[PDB]
């Protein structure tokens, strides 16, 4: 591979480097092999990244797997959408995947657990005859008695 690196006079140049690429993955152990650069080793298995290098390095792997998918088709999506997703996947500290009367089953559980429904969802608000505290509902409007 070609690697853009700054040159002695400051400008970026290409400098090829050999790179190995493997079928299969043993990160903890291959990292440790003499002669490699352990600081730049990579895998497309973001689980292994999180297991060896931690939640943040996994978060940043995961983004880079997501971004590869979307660019390999040739399209472009702004950072922050994929960043949102990948934060949602890693904010508990591991990698969490994103993938008249019924339902009763669930309300019984609510009961017995003392479930507190925050009432911020649009369905819950429908059932109650209300607007959801989203967008145009995320503030109240009141009559301005303080004015002339």
């Amino acid at each position: 591979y070609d690697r853009k690196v700054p040159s002695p006079t400051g400008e970026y140049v290409k400098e090829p480097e050999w790179v190995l690429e493997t079928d299969g993955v043993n990160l903890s152990e291959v990292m440790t092999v003499p002669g490699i650069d352990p600081t730049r080793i990579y895998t497309n298995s973001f689980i292994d990244i999180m297991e060896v290098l931690g939640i943040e390095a996994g978060r940043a792997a995961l983004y880079k797997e997501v971004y590869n998918v979307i660019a390999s088709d040739g399209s472009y999506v702004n950072y922050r959408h994929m960043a949102l997703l990948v934060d949602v996947m890693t904010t508990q500290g591991g990698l969490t995947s994103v993938t008249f009367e019924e339902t009763v089953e669930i309300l019984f559980e609510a009961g017995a657990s003392a479930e507190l429904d925050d009432c911020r969802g649009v369905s819950e608000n429908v059932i109650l005859g209300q607007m959801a505290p989203i967008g145009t509902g995320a503030f109240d409007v009141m009559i301005d008695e303080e004015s002339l």
Binding site: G111, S113, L116, C119
Partner: protein, 295 residues
Amino acid sequence: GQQYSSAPLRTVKEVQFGLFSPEEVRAISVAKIRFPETMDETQTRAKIGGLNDPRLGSIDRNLKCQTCQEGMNECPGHFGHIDLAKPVFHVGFIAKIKKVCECVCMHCGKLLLDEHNELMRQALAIKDSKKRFAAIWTLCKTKMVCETDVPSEDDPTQLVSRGGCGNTQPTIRKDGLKLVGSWKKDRATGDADEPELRVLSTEEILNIFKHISVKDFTSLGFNEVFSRPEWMILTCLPVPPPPVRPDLTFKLADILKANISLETLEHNGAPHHAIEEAESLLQFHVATYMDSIRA
């Protein structure tokens, strides 16, 4: 409903789920529901102080409840109650009832594993109260004894006491609405083969639940105020007003017929087994009542 209310007007920002203790149900009742009938004082086709108007609702046009007045129309519905001769299970929670049972010592009320144990310390740690129950249940459903004394973390030559008791634990199966207990000594050596099977009365289960420490039932997902584990066993049963009913009365009738005759037997002195069988029809009609209110 075009009439006026001095009560300030607001939207609902929070829904807090739980269960109705028997105290709070007696607490916000009007009527004690005891006779199971509509109308005809002897033979007067009009209104009875026993079910139907005993202070809750009204068809009648009459702008009348219990000085609450308003139209057969801007009346919420008020809430009735019916004290139950014996406790019965809530049908909806038989399977919860069963798994608490499996977590807790069926003499003392004390959780079967605790801080000392360590796989349990990690389940104890979990955050989500439904994953946590799940996890502690997995550790405890195995545990056949209420231990006295248990290795510590530390220098395990030595043991350390925990609040004890020592009693062996049933394997519990489900058999309709009946939970069934099965005790050993061992897994088939010398000492004791043949288990002793024995039904779990609601009565003993309610009684074990009332004995489980706040710490220990919180730990299972329950909450001191809003849902304690006892409250999955009914004692006191809410009667909805006529706004709820469009033939659910025809069914609460039947609950009372059963409540009336379990009490007339328990009064008369009456054999062990009749008392139990009338207890089981109570239960079935209180179960059917709600597994019907899924509608």
